[PDB]
Amino acid sequence: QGIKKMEGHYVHAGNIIATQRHFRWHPGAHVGVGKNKCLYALEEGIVRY
Amino acid sequence: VELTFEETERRALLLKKWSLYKQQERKMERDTIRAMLEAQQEALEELQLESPKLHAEAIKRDPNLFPFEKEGPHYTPPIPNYQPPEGRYNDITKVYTQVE
Amino acid sequence: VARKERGWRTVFPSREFWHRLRVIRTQHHVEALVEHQNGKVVVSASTREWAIKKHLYSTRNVVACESIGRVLAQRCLEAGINFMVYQPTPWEAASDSMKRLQSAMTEGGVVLREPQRIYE
Amino acid sequence: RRTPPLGPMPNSDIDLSNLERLEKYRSFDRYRRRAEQEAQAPHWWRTYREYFGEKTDPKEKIDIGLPPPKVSRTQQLLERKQAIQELRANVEEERAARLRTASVPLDAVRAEWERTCGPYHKQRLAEYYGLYRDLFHGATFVPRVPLHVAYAVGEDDLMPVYCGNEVTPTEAAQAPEVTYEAEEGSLWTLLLTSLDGHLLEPDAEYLHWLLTNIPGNRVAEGQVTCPYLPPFPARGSGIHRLAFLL
Amino acid sequence: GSPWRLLGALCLQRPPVVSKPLTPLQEEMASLLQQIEIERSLYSDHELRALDENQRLAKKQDILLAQDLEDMWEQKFLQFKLGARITEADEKNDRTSLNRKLDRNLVLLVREKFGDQDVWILPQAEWQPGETLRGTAERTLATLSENNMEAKFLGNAPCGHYTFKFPQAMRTESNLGAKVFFFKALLLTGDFSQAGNKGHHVWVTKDELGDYLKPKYLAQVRRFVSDL
Amino acid sequence: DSSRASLTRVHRQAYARLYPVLLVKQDGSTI
Amino acid sequence: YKTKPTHGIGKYKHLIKAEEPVRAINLGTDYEYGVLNIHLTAYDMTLAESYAQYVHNLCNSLSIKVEESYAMPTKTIEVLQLQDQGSKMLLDSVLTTHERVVQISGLSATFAEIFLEIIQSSLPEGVRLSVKEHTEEDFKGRFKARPELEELLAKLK
RNA sequence: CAGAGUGUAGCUUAACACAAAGCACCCAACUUACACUUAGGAGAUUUCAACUUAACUUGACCGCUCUGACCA
Ligand SMILES: [K+]
């Protein structure tokens, strides 16, 4: 588990940004969250923290 | 019984004058406390300048103070020569006891 | 077809909207705002302005809230705003002052839900 | 390895010693109100406003409009307080406001609104629609003079043009009726432009109407520099915005 | 030593004996609360007893009725005469007696003679080494003439201070003036004897407290003397 | 003032009506 | 991130009281009384509940910690009167004594002189005030009497 | 008594004007009570002038505060 896409990386819609067992990172703009607190990209673009 | 329009009108208008009357009771009580506290703190300062030995005794607590008992006023004062009837006081307070 | 700012599922309020109705009621006044997701304010209606204050007995009562919706709905139609979301709290939504502000906005022609975005 | 903060941290002011003698929030709306204040403040760390916020220039946008009116605040405030006392003295307004049956006249609210704070609202609205950015390259102005435009549809109806309301090209096939308060001896100039209608150049605009050297309020007497041409938004091109400038 | 004399003053109070009268607004509200308390209450055993009898009497073994029993109670009440909230000292206006003005709080005032001049002040005693400032106030009661009163002192800190200067006659580098510190107390029980009453002392409400005291001495006493 | 917190009503949903009376004490006083 | 300057920006548990699972009684310093019990006993149940509610709100306005506000068991008292020209005591009335308590901690020595004079002034008619220091005896007076433990204790003796 | 200082309802470095704001506060209902919430309530620029905008600047007029005079 952990970050799959770091700051500045380009992602496509659906790409998983981070996996976690507890909420270490929270979903912001155009970032979804699944059952298991998995953060995924809702749009194509650049990742920012 | 249903309440007449004039009745509710009077009650509602009475609770609007009662919210402002209690606002002045609290204002006087708030100011009175301030006066008391401002006079006490200012007297202690003048006492420190005169003799810091007495100021160290005044700021100390008074163990004789508590327990502090006080009964509330009456509606009519005691009569000088009044003899009550004869009787007896019997407690019937249910005693509760814990088993198990 | 414009994308909404989806996300923010672990916080409050949401951002998945184009326009938002935000109600601010203080100890003395009541204010309703229509603002865009970017923060800009489009139209507003407050009891601080003489126009509305000269006709109200109390600026902080239910009537004031009901009258702020009748004035805001009329201003949202002129601006072109016909849909917007409202994000209240459980105690705000159950209040009789917010129930009358919504009814006043709908009777004015404003819909308190935005249409779904078209992706395809 | 540790790096020292570049500035004051969020909750440093708080005193942890007397943590049991500090006023708490006790409510979710009181924390939320403080959380919105600190969210709209500048910070040295990365923020959502940095990456998504609409970038602006530090050079304050210049004002090219008319000067404001001069009003006596003291004489204004005195008259307003007196009117509220009369309105509040009447027991029929108190009873209606307590029974929740009172209502304000929407027609009088809008006439006084147009006089006091309507210009500033219309300005805020034009900035949202992007008119100052496109027309004047960022320069702003307050519309002190209410401009009342209305299209004649039929023989009894009217379609008022406000600030962003939808109007069809069928209703706007003939020139509208334009009225505005002006003194005698003054000269004006009206104008209608399509900001988004252009088919070839993005930045450019189409001129739909230009009336010059208008005496007072009489629009017909003004010279017709460019005849009226109805809007012609292409199909599948979206929604356009036409502006009347006075 | 210092050029300021230390004096331990005392502010003895007789708290209310009776409840204060209700104001016109409190009356309108108290009648409503008892009216609201009835409209939202269940029938009492005395109301169900009367209703049942009304039906049984209407149809046709209870010897005593409800309305009949109420009359007995009222008779005994009209026979009992209550104590007077307004005493003879309120009509005679004897400001030396505790019994007067039962509803309001009273403050003690004793007249002392300084420089061949009579002045009203609060009981006070000069401080002595080997004694707390409050201990000086506890002593004042003992110095009072033919007094049998038990006072309850509230804390050790003073509730007020007054400073004055000798009017350039007794002024000296050794003695410039005085500094009195007041301590509040409550009069649990007791009163003076009947030997000397009038010229000695009076018990005065805070409103009528100015007549006796001086302007400057009054302003400092009206700060810790409440009239709640 | 004694009237600060004296004006009240029974704050119960269900309760039997209560009547006001004078409780004469062993010294003549009343409440 | 630990190496970054914005490390620790999410720390929140140093702002919260340590709540990590009866009560040890606080004993006052020379300058401040530790704990106090304000007892409000009255024959009327509305006057005790209202004066207690006044003291609780007054203490808050004055920034005084109210540890606990509770009630004590009611005491019912049958009042018998000597029958007219006789010797048998006949039931006259039934009086109930109602008591309310307001537990406060953190009262300064100097300020108690003031706080006490305020409450005793606003004391209603028929209501009695008693301010005592808290003791385990009081806390054990609110619990039911265990008689099984008293028989077993006697056997040990 | 003069001497200086001081000036929005309780606080505020709220007040560009579009406007006297925000919080604190009071009653009732919910709550053992408190708190939360809902529904209601009361409110201020010391007063006059100054070419006007003047709560803001300049003057006094007003009260407050402080240091002595005064003082038992
Ligand atoms: K175009």
Interface of C with D in 23-62 (CB under 8 A): 36, 38-44, 49-58, 61-62
CA to C1' distance (Å), from C91 to H37: 7
CATH code: domain of residue C57: 3.30.420.80
Torsion of CA E194, E200, E206, E212, to 10 degrees: 150
DSSP character at residue C4: P
A28/D48 CB distance under 8 A: yes
Beta carbons of A35 and A21 less than 8 angstroms apart: no
Closest CA to C58 of D204, G22, G98, D98: D98
Chains meeting F at 3+ CB pairs closer than 8 A? B, E, G
Of F2, F8, F23, the CB nearest to G50: F8
Closest partner CB to E82 (pick from B18, B46, B76): B76
Is residue B41 in some structural domain? yes
Q: Indicate the helix (H) or strand (E) that contains C90.
A: helix C90-94
DSSP G49: H
Copy the structure tokens of residue A25: 């990172």
Residue B11: domain span: 1-78
CA of D173 to the centre of ligand 1 (A): 21
With beta carbons under 8 A apart, name residues in chain E contacting F17.
37-38, 41-44, 47
Q: Which of D53, D104, D108 sits opposite C56 (nearest CB)?
A: D104
Helix ranges (DSSP H) in D40-190:
48-52, 73-89, 91-99, 106-116, 118-129, 131-136
Q: What are the residue boundaries of the structural domains of chain F, listed by start?
A: 1-31
The DSSP call for residue D235 is T
PDB experimental method: cryo-EM
- Which of D48, E226, C71, B25 has its CA nearest to residue G54? B25
CA distances from G141 to E186, G43, G72 (A): 31, 20, 9
Contact C81, C43 (CB under 8 A): yes
The answer to whether D29 faces chain C, any CB pair under 8 Å, is: yes
C60 nearest nucleotide via C1' and CA: H40
Strand partners, D78: none
F31 touching B (Cβ < 8 Å): yes
G93 touches chain E (CB under 8 A): no
- Contact between A24 and A38 (Cβ < 8 Å): no
Q: Which positions of strand H lie within 7 Å of protein CB atoms?
A: 17-43, 45, 52-56, 69-72
DSSP B94: P
Instruction: Name the CATH topology of F1-31.
Output: Ribosomal Protein L25; Chain P (6.20.130)
CB G89 within 8 A of CB G82: yes
* Touch criterion met for E and D (3+ Cβ pairs within 8 Å): no
Distance CA E222, CA B36 (A): 10
Please give the Cα distance from G116 to G108 (Å, whole number): 12
CA angle D6, D10, D13 (to 5 degrees): 105
- What is the bridge-based pairing of β-strands C19-25 and B87-91? unpaired
Q: How many CA atoms lie within 13 A of E184 on its CB side?
A: 27
Question: Can you read off the two tokens belonging to residue D214?
Answer: 């208008």
What's the Rg (C-alpha) of chain E?
Answer: 27
Residue D177 Cα to chain centre, angstroms: 23
Q: Closest Cα to residue C117, out of D244, A42, D60, E124?
A: A42
The token duo for B62 is 């008074």
User: 3-class SS at G108?
Assistant: strand
The span from the CA of G126 to the CA of G43, in Å, is 7
CA distance D54 to chain G (A): 25
Ligand 1 centre distance from Cα of residue D206 (Å): 10
CA to C1' distance (Å), from B26 to H26? 8
- Can you read off the two tokens belonging to residue D167? 């109007």
Work out the angle at residue E85's Cα, subtended by the Cα atoms of residues E80 and E87, and round it to the nearest 5 degrees. 110
DSSP annotation string for chain E: --SEEEEEEEEEEE--SBPPPPPHHHHHHHHHHHHHHHHTSBPPHHHHHHHHHHHHHHH---SS-HHHHHHHHHHHHHHS-PPPSS-HHHHHT-TT-TTS-SSS-EEEEEEEE-SS-EEEE--EEE--SSS-HHHHHHHHHHHSTTEEEEEEE--SS-SEEEEEE--SSS--SS--EEEEEEEEEEEEEEEE-SSS-TTTEEEE-SGGGTTTS-HHHHHHHTTT----
First to last CA, chain F: 16
Q: How far apart are CA B23 and CA B81, in angstroms?
A: 43
First to last CA, chain B: 51
Structural domain boundaries, residue D171: 122-246
Look up residue E122 and give its two tokens: 């609060």
Cβ neighbours around A14 below 10 Å, total: 10
Q: Please give the Cα distance from D209 to D227 (Å, whole number).
A: 6
* Domain count within chain B: 1
Subunit contact A30:C6, Cβ cutoff 8 A: yes
Alpha-carbon gap, residue B54 to E129, rounded angstroms:
10
Do residues G70 and G101 lie in contact, with contact meaning Cβ atoms separated by under 8 Å? yes
Q: Say if the Cβ atoms of B78 and F24 lie within 8 Å.
A: no
Tokens of E182: 């007041």
Tell me the CA distances in angstroms from A7 to A42, A47, G11, one per residue in order.
16, 5, 23
In whole angstroms, H27 C1' to D94 CA is 18
Nearest to A47 by CA among A5, A4, A1, A3: A5
In b/e form, how buried is each residue of E165-177, taking b as 16+ CB within 10 angstroms?
A: eeeeeeeeeeeee
D114, D120, D122, D125: CA torsion to nearest 10: -150
Residue type, E155: G
CA dihedral D164, D167, D169, D173 (to 10 degrees): -100
* H/E run at residue G50: helix G45-61
- Who's near C26: CB < 8 A, 6+ residues apart? C60
- Burial class of E44 by CB neighbour count within 10 A (0 to 12, 13 to 18, 19+): middle
Please compute Rg for chain F using Cα positions: 13
How distant, in Å, are the alpha carbons of B20, C85, D159, D177, D240 from that of D196?
60, 28, 22, 23, 5
Query: How far apart are the C-alpha atoms of E3 and E1, rounded to whole Å?
Result: 7
The DSSP 8-state label assigned to residue C7 in this structure reads B
Residue C38, CA distances (Å) to D52, D53, D97, D194, E225 in order? 8, 7, 37, 25, 61
Q: Which residue pairs from B64-68 have beta carbons closer than 8 angstroms and sit at least 24 positions apart in sequence?
A: B65/E154, B65/E155, B65/G112, B66/G33, B66/G36, B66/G131, B66/G132, B66/G133, B67/G130, B67/G131, B67/G132, B67/G133, B68/E152, B68/G116, B68/G129, B68/G130, B68/G131
Contacts of A36 by beta carbon, 8 Å cutoff, 6+ apart = A19, A21
What is the three-class DSSP state of D33?
helix
Kindly report the nearest CA distance between residue D11 and chain G, in angstroms: 8
Read off the tokens for E186: 């409550």
Burial of F26 (0-12, 13-18, 19+ CB in 10 A): exposed
Q: Nearest to residue G119, comparing CAs of E154, E18, B22, F2?
A: F2
Tell me the nt nearest to G55, Cα to C1'.
H33
Strands E177-192 and E147-153, how do they pair?
Answer: antiparallel
Please judge whether E15 and G109 are an interchain contact, meaning their C-beta atoms are less than 8 angstroms apart: no
- CB D80 to CB C50 under 8 A? yes
Q: Specify if B87 maps to a domain.
A: no
The chain G residue lying nearest E14, using CA atoms, is G121
DSSP A37: S
Instruction: For Cα atoms D97, C42, D117, give the angle at the middle one, nearest 5 degrees.
Output: 60
Nearest of E208, E181, E186, E179 to residue E141 by alpha carbon:
E186
Task: Give the chains touching G; criterion: ≥3 Cβ pairs < 8 Å.
Answer: B, D, E, F
Under 8 Å between Cβ of G144 and B98: yes
Cβ neighbours for G83, distance < 8 A, ≥ 6 positions apart: G89, G90
Task: Please tell me what DSSP assigns to residue D219.
Answer: S
Long-range contacts of G142-151 (CB under 8 A, 24+ apart): G142/G70, G142/G72, G142/G73, G143/B98, G144/B96, G144/B97, G144/B98, G145/B95, G145/B96, G145/B97, G145/B98, G146/B97, G146/B98, G146/B99, G147/B97, G147/B99, G148/B99
Query: CA G25, CA D228: separation in Å to the nearest integer?
Result: 90
How far apart CA D171 and CA B83 sit, in angstroms, is 101
Sign of CA pseudo-dihedral G142, G140, G18, C10: negative
Is residue B99 in some structural domain?
Answer: no
What are the backbone dihedrals phi and psi of residue C42, each rounded to the nearest 5 degrees, phi first? -95, -60
F28 in B contact zone (CB under 8 Å): yes
Phi, psi of G35 (to 5 degrees): -140, 155
CB E182 within 8 A of CB E10: yes
Report which residue is nearest nucleotide H26 when distances run from CA to C1': B23
Neighbouring residues of A26: CB distance < 8 A, sequence distance ≥ 6:
C10, C11
Q: Which residues contact C21 (CB under 8 A, 6 or more apart)?
A: C32, C33, C34, C84, C85, C86, C105, C112
Alpha-carbon torsion (E40, E45, E48, E50), positive or negative: negative
Give the resolution to one decimal, in Å.
2.6
D-chain residues near G3 (CB < 8 A): 1-3
Cβ-based burial of E61 (10 A; exposed 0-12, middle 13-18, buried ≥19): exposed
Residues 59-118 in G contacting B (C-alpha not used; CB under 8 Å): 61-62, 73-82, 89, 92, 109-114, 116-118
- Secondary structure (DSSP) of E102-168: SSS-EEEEEEEE-SS-EEEE--EEE--SSS-HHHHHHHHHHHSTTEEEEEEE--SS-SEEEEEE--S
Q: Decide: E19 and F22 in contact? Cβ < 8 Å.
A: no
Query: In this structure, which residues have their CB less than 5 angstroms from ion ligand 1?
Result: D 198
Q: Give yes or no for a cis peptide into D202 (omega within 30° of 0).
A: no
Cβ contacts of F7 on chain E, cutoff 8 Å: 26, 29-30, 33
Which nucleotide has its C1' atom closest to residue D68's CA? H17
Rounded to whole angstroms, the distance from the CA of residue B76 to the C1' of nucleotide H27 is: 31
Q: At what angle do helices D106-116 and D118-129 cross, to 10 degrees?
A: 80
SS3 letters for B26-80?
A: HHHHHHHHHHHHHHHHHHHHHHHHHCHHHHHHHCCCCCCCCCEEEECCECECCCC
Confirm if G138 and G59 have CB atoms less than 8 A apart: no
Phi, psi of A14 (to 5 degrees): 105, -20
Residue showing tokens 């006789």:
G86
> Which amino acid type is present at position C34?
V
Amino acid identity of D38? E
Question: In sequence order, what are the residues at sequence separation of 6 or more whose Cβ sits closer than 8 angstroms to the Cβ of residue D213?
Answer: D187, D189, D222, D223
For residue E137, report the phi and psi dihedrals to the nearest 5 degrees: -70, -40
Give the length of chain B. Answer: 100
**Chain position carrying tokens 């609290």:** B26
The single-letter code of the amino acid at D3 is: T
For an interface test with F, the pick among B15, B18, B82, B86 (most F C-beta atoms closer than 10 Å) comes out as B82
List alpha helices for D40-105, DSSP H: 48-52, 73-89, 91-99
Q: Is C10 on the interface with A (CB under 8 A)?
A: yes
Q: Are E151 and E145 in contact (CB under 8 A)?
A: no
3-state helix, strand, coil in chain F (%, to 5): 0, 5, 95
Nearest to C56 by CA among C45, C68, C43: C68
What does the DSSP 8-state code read for residue D217? Answer: T
Tell me which residue of C57, C60, C82 sits closest to C72, measured CA to CA: C82
D interface mutation test: which of C12, C42, C44 has the most D CBs within 10 A?
Answer: C42
Distance between CA atoms of residues A36 and A21, nearest Å: 7
In degrees and rounded to multiples of 5, residue C99 shows phi and psi of -65, -30
Contact check, Cβ <8 Å, D3/G15: no
Q: State yes or no: cis peptide before D119, omega within 30 of 0.
A: no
CA–CA gap between residue C69 and residue C73 (Å, rounded):
6
G50, G126 in Cβ contact below 8 A? no
Calculate the CA dihedral of residues E113, E114, E120, E123 and round it to 10 degrees: -90
Region of E26 (left: φ > 0; alpha: ψ -120 to 50; beta: rest) is alpha
State the residue range of the domain holding C24.
Answer: 1-119
Q: How far apart are CA G88 and CA D5, in angstroms?
A: 89
